[model samples]
Target: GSALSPEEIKAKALDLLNKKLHRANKFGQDQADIDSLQRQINRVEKFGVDLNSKLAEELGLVSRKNE
Candidate 1:
């Protein structure tokens, strides 16, 4: 089966994070949920970096000097 593309994964991660933030604010004391969401966010960010590095380089968003 095909998996989500990098862009789709990043978009969904942001969407979920936003929803969770709203829930945390409305419900109060959702620190654990927030923590779990943070893990997800970190993982997705790392995934994007790994998978989209070439794309970013091609787009000139990443400087060759950094590498």
Candidate 2:
């Protein structure tokens, strides 16, 4: 009695997935991809902090530097 066919179900699922991936980011629709992107951001921030600390230490090592 249902109006939905098997083909219609498949199409509906695909449509929903596309919407989740693009529209509601907080839904965690594309979890693997979202996790990968977050990890990349964390790595970039960590690298920046490490570089800043190294540079600051180097500047401090200069004998005539006043700060």
Candidate 3:
């Protein structure tokens, strides 16, 4: 790969930072959804972690790929 000019490097860095910021915003919203779901489960179940079925219980439907 060729060495990038300073200007090009700065532009690329800014582009990546912008993308990361957008991704962080999206994840923050997703975390809010998870928090709301957790609250609902707590109100209904009042139960601790289901150790026997750990992965599904802890993560539930939080996988964005699943949605």
For all candidates, what are the clash counts? 0, 0, 0
C-alpha lDDT of all candidate models, in order:
0.58, 0.42, 0.43
Q: Candidate 1 at 8: error in angstroms? A: 1.5
Tens digits of per-residue lDDT for model 2 on 1-67?
A: 5555544433443344335445546775577865544443344344421223322233232243447
Weakest ten-residue segment in model 1 by summed lDDT: 49-58
Compared with the true structure, what per-residue lDDT tens digits does model 3 show for residues 1-67? 5755545443444344345445656677576655544443343243422323322234341332343
Residue 53 C-alpha lDDT in model 1: 42
What order do you get sorting by TM-score, best first?
1, 3, 2
Candidate 3's C-alpha runs over 4 A off are: 29-67
> How much does candidate 2 score in TM-score?
0.33
Better of 1 and 2 by lDDT: 1
Compared with the true structure, the alpha-carbon lDDT of candidate 3 equals 0.43
